[PDB]
Design a protein around this ligand. Structure first.
Ligand SMILES: C[C@H]1O[C@H](O[C@H]2[C@H](O)[C@@H](O)[C@@H](O[C@H]3[C@H](O)[C@@H](O)[C@H](O)O[C@@H]3CO)O[C@@H]2CO)[C@H](O)[C@@H](O)[C@@H]1N[C@H]1C=C(CO)[C@@H](O[C@H]2O[C@H](CO)[C@@H](O[C@H]3O[C@H](C)[C@@H](N[C@H]4C=C(CO)[C@@H](O)[C@H](O)[C@H]4O)[C@H](O)[C@H]3O)[C@H](O)[C@H]2O)[C@H](O)[C@H]1O
Ligand SMILES: *[C@@H]1O[C@H](CO)[C@@H](O)[C@H](O)[C@H]1NC(C)=O
Ligand SMILES: [Ca+2]
Length: 438
């Protein structure tokens, strides 16, 4: 599918080894650094659980055969073989077919930059099977962009020689063939900053579907130019603003300034992927154990401009810290649809979220501790006061809500009516307020 077809989607990001088991065990995994046993049928069995929160797309782990310990998929060995830990080729096709039958997209995570670690330089059984196929090993100096591109991620992931045309062609065929064989609707591209930027347009063209690229960097002037090559980027610049406001009490000018910086630096903010958690960052609740602040952050993330991503296990209140502690197994939760955050995410992401022709007006009211924006016909009011807050809030409603319009908040059923271009209401437990016109 193309960018236009992704604009109104909402993505559930899962780690395949950690989402679901086909044997229905709920038992804990004793080593989060090695395979825990998740598989495709384990995902397929829970598509109703995912869709019930309003998600209409899933992002899955990379699929190829990995080196030892590559439970996350990012350590490819032979790119053209499947990771047998996750299940059969028929199980992957069946998951995609089942998702499509529910109107859902499947986004494949892809790596072009590197292979997994090779024991003593033995590239036996690797797609790129001779040391000459990789750049010489060196440690990245992240202040030297050519180093970022030529040296080895984590100083041990063999860095594929992306300046050799035969290798470039191979990488193109790898991604094209994954997409066409399994009928993926989009890709999430790993390690984008680690290959020369001009490689990426040819790679997305080979894939033939919408791509969102991972440029792990908070500087929009560094990330933004990559959208000349790729349809979308992972919104790392906004991520830091969201965390600063909701987990560290920054004023909302941090978010309004960052939204301006994104508009200045990205040709199309509307397709950037918005997130507040992922597999490379400690989960929000490990940083700030305040459910009201997290709910505000999630309401903002899901409904602001862009294409939202929610990291699996958010909806069960998962709270693990740094990798691997943020790759908890989900099956211990038994997929509880009565969990606090499941019900909350369903309101935001199923009930309020616009699923076609998404429109957002940012910066309807920028306060110090409050922020209002419109999403569709709804007025979204977020805050960073904290749990327990019952502060009176007054916000402007913007140009499309008439005086005398009755608004009802979908989260806490607060009622407020527009008077003189504003609403005033009292917070409930510091919660975000998602005002729907009567
Ligand atoms: C993970 C991430 O790394 C890189 O991101 C950099 C970023 O480029 C830097 O700029 C900076 O970011 C700044 C940012 O720019 C600022 O604006 C902001 O203010 O601050 C941040 C933070 O300083 O740092 C980050 C993080 O270092 C890449 O650019 C990015 O693409 C990466 N994300 C991708 C990539 C991979 C690789 O395919 C995925 O990770 C997978 O692989 C890793 C590595 O194997 C694995 O890591 C776990 O397991 C390892 C065995 C363990 N030890 C290894 C790491 C070493 C040093 O890094 C060695 O010392 C050691 O010998 C190695 O064995 C790791 O510690 C452990 O975390 C992941 O589990 C696996 O998932 C990412 O998931 C993917 O999204
Ligand atoms: C920048 O990185 C490249 C690639 O590793 C390296 O060859 C070059 O010497 C670096 N520049 C400096 C000044 O160190
Ligand atoms: Ca590279």
């Amino acid at each position: 599918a193309a960018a236009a077809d992704w604009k109104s989607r909402s993505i559930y990001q899962l780690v395949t080894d950690r989402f679901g088991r086909s044997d229905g065990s709920t038992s804990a995994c004793g080593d989060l650094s090695n395979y825990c046993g998740g598989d495709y049928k384990g995902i397929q069995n829970q598509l109703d659980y995912i869709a019930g929160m309003g998600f209409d797309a899933i992002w899955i782990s990379p699929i190829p055969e990995n080196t030892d310990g590559g439970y996350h998929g990012y350590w490819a060995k032979d790119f053209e073989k499947l990771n047998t830990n996750f299940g059969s080729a028929d199980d992957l096709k069946a998951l995609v077919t089942a998702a499509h039958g529910k109107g859902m997209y499947v986004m494949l995570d892809v790596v072009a930059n590197h292979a997994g670690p090779a024991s003593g330089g033995d590239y036996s059984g690797f797609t790129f099977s001779s040391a000459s196929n990789y750049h010489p090993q060196c440690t990245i100096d992240y202040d030297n962009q050519t180093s970022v591109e030529q040296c080895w991620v984590a100083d041990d992931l063999p860095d594929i020689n992306t300046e050799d045309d035969t290798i470039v062609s191979k990488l193109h065929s790898i991604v094209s063939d994954w997409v066409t064989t399994y009928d993926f609707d989009g890709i999430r591209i790993d390690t984008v900053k680690h290959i020369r930027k001009d490689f990426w347009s040819g790679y997305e063209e080979a894939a033939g579907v919408f791509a969102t690229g991972e440029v792990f960097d908070g500087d929009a002037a560094y990330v933004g130019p990559y959208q000349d090559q790729l349809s979308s980027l992972i919104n790392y610049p906004l991520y830091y603003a969201i965390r600063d406001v909701f987990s560290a009490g920054s004023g909302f000018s941090r978010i309004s300034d960052m939204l301006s910086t994104i508009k200045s630096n990205f040709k199309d903010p509307s397709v950037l992927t918005t997130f507040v958690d992922n597999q490379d960052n400690a989960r929000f609740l490990s940083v700030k154990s305040d459910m009201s602040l997290y709910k505000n952050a999630l309401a903002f993330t899901i409904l602001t401009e862009g294409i939202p991503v929610v990291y699996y296990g958010t909806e069960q209140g998962f709270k693990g810290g740094d990798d691997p502690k943020n790759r908890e197994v989900l099956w211990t939760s038994n997929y509880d649809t009565s969990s606090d955050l499941y019900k909350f995410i369903k309101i935001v992401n199923n009930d309020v979220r616009q699923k076609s022709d998404k429109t957002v007006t940012l910066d309807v009211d920028v306060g110090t501790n409050t922020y209002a924006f419109t999403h569709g016909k709804n007025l979204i009011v977020v805050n960073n006061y904290g749990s327990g807050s019952t502060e009176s809030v007054t916000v402007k409603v913007g140009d499309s809500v008439a005086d005398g319009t009755k608004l009802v908040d979908a989260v806490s059923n607060i009622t407020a009516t527009v008077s003189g271009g504003s609403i005033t209401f009292s917070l409930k437990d510091g919660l975000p307020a998602l005002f729907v016109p009567s």
